[PDB]
């Protein structure tokens, strides 16, 4: 009964998908469970980072056990297909 807002941009599509997810943290594996289609993707998430000239970078996450970065109180991902 406690939550973070997860939203991702999927394989190009410019309107993103948003949805509520339960529990103070989210991991890449939890995130991967939201995806509707199967296959091989790379996963990037918006994240603030002081060593880049305009603040943000999209961090790649590979391991399901990882905690996903948070940005402006949301989780924001780009999901990209390995062509
Ligand atoms: Hg609770
Ligand atoms: Hg796709």
mmCIF file of C-alpha atoms and ligand atoms in Angstrom:
data_model
loop_
_atom_site.group_PDB
_atom_site.id
_atom_site.type_symbol
_atom_site.label_atom_id
_atom_site.label_comp_id
_atom_site.label_asym_id
_atom_site.label_seq_id
_atom_site.Cartn_x
_atom_site.Cartn_y
_atom_site.Cartn_z
ATOM 1 C CA UNK A 1 0.000 0.000 0.000
ATOM 2 C CA UNK A 2 3.008 2.245 -0.752
ATOM 3 C CA UNK A 3 4.165 3.011 -4.297
ATOM 4 C CA UNK A 4 6.381 4.490 -7.044
ATOM 5 C CA UNK A 5 5.196 5.548 -10.512
ATOM 6 C CA UNK A 6 6.900 3.596 -13.328
ATOM 7 C CA UNK A 7 6.879 4.838 -16.917
ATOM 8 C CA UNK A 8 8.743 3.651 -19.947
ATOM 9 C CA UNK A 9 9.202 4.590 -23.597
ATOM 10 C CA UNK A 10 8.862 1.349 -25.552
ATOM 11 C CA UNK A 11 10.782 0.538 -28.782
ATOM 12 C CA UNK A 12 10.336 3.983 -30.310
ATOM 13 C CA UNK A 13 6.691 4.849 -29.595
ATOM 14 C CA UNK A 14 6.658 8.423 -28.357
ATOM 15 C CA UNK A 15 3.679 8.119 -26.084
ATOM 16 C CA UNK A 16 4.970 6.298 -23.024
ATOM 17 C CA UNK A 17 3.291 3.794 -20.772
ATOM 18 C CA UNK A 18 2.799 4.661 -17.091
ATOM 19 C CA UNK A 19 1.516 2.573 -14.231
ATOM 20 C CA UNK A 20 1.667 2.331 -10.439
ATOM 21 C CA UNK A 21 3.981 -0.242 -8.796
ATOM 22 C CA UNK A 22 4.118 -1.433 -5.192
ATOM 23 C CA UNK A 23 6.838 -0.931 -2.641
ATOM 24 C CA UNK A 24 9.395 1.840 -2.050
ATOM 25 C CA UNK A 25 11.806 0.249 -4.519
ATOM 26 C CA UNK A 26 11.657 -1.245 -7.932
ATOM 27 C CA UNK A 27 14.088 -3.639 -9.523
ATOM 28 C CA UNK A 28 14.761 -4.264 -13.220
ATOM 29 C CA UNK A 29 13.175 -7.684 -12.772
ATOM 30 C CA UNK A 30 10.026 -6.153 -11.331
ATOM 31 C CA UNK A 31 10.146 -3.706 -14.238
ATOM 32 C CA UNK A 32 10.722 -6.396 -16.863
ATOM 33 C CA UNK A 33 7.552 -8.048 -15.570
ATOM 34 C CA UNK A 34 5.546 -5.053 -16.878
ATOM 35 C CA UNK A 35 6.699 -5.426 -20.438
ATOM 36 C CA UNK A 36 4.053 -6.954 -22.711
ATOM 37 C CA UNK A 37 6.212 -8.349 -25.471
ATOM 38 C CA UNK A 38 8.980 -10.985 -25.322
ATOM 39 C CA UNK A 39 12.484 -10.779 -26.720
ATOM 40 C CA UNK A 40 15.849 -9.133 -26.278
ATOM 41 C CA UNK A 41 15.973 -5.516 -25.178
ATOM 42 C CA UNK A 42 18.325 -3.088 -23.464
ATOM 43 C CA UNK A 43 16.995 -1.137 -20.530
ATOM 44 C CA UNK A 44 17.797 2.461 -19.737
ATOM 45 C CA UNK A 45 16.469 4.591 -16.876
ATOM 46 C CA UNK A 46 16.576 8.367 -16.330
ATOM 47 C CA UNK A 47 18.903 9.258 -13.484
ATOM 48 C CA UNK A 48 20.521 12.431 -12.198
ATOM 49 C CA UNK A 49 24.275 12.525 -12.441
ATOM 50 C CA UNK A 50 26.586 15.447 -11.646
ATOM 51 C CA UNK A 51 29.363 14.483 -14.096
ATOM 52 C CA UNK A 52 27.347 15.231 -17.261
ATOM 53 C CA UNK A 53 26.834 18.709 -18.657
ATOM 54 C CA UNK A 54 23.037 18.982 -18.445
ATOM 55 C CA UNK A 55 22.248 16.818 -15.411
ATOM 56 C CA UNK A 56 20.613 13.576 -16.529
ATOM 57 C CA UNK A 57 21.773 10.375 -18.121
ATOM 58 C CA UNK A 58 19.862 7.195 -19.045
ATOM 59 C CA UNK A 59 21.591 4.467 -17.104
ATOM 60 C CA UNK A 60 21.566 0.983 -18.544
ATOM 61 C CA UNK A 61 20.489 -1.776 -16.175
ATOM 62 C CA UNK A 62 21.115 -5.431 -16.906
ATOM 63 C CA UNK A 63 20.599 -7.414 -13.719
ATOM 64 C CA UNK A 64 17.070 -8.300 -12.557
ATOM 65 C CA UNK A 65 18.124 -7.934 -8.927
ATOM 66 C CA UNK A 66 19.093 -4.249 -9.332
ATOM 67 C CA UNK A 67 17.373 -1.293 -7.925
ATOM 68 C CA UNK A 68 16.205 1.092 -10.571
ATOM 69 C CA UNK A 69 17.225 4.760 -10.274
ATOM 70 C CA UNK A 70 14.611 7.347 -9.422
ATOM 71 C CA UNK A 71 14.150 10.679 -11.149
ATOM 72 C CA UNK A 72 11.785 13.383 -9.931
ATOM 73 C CA UNK A 73 10.054 10.810 -7.734
ATOM 74 C CA UNK A 74 9.178 8.650 -10.754
ATOM 75 C CA UNK A 75 10.846 5.780 -12.582
ATOM 76 C CA UNK A 76 11.426 6.596 -16.209
ATOM 77 C CA UNK A 77 12.716 4.046 -18.682
ATOM 78 C CA UNK A 78 13.497 3.637 -22.328
ATOM 79 C CA UNK A 79 13.147 0.065 -23.531
ATOM 80 C CA UNK A 80 15.048 -0.641 -26.761
ATOM 81 C CA UNK A 81 15.048 -3.743 -28.963
ATOM 82 C CA UNK A 82 18.307 -5.257 -30.046
ATOM 83 C CA UNK A 83 17.903 -5.114 -33.806
HETATM 84 HG HG1 LIG B 1 1.534 -1.632 3.325
HETATM 85 HG HG1 LIG B 2 9.605 -3.311 -29.508
#
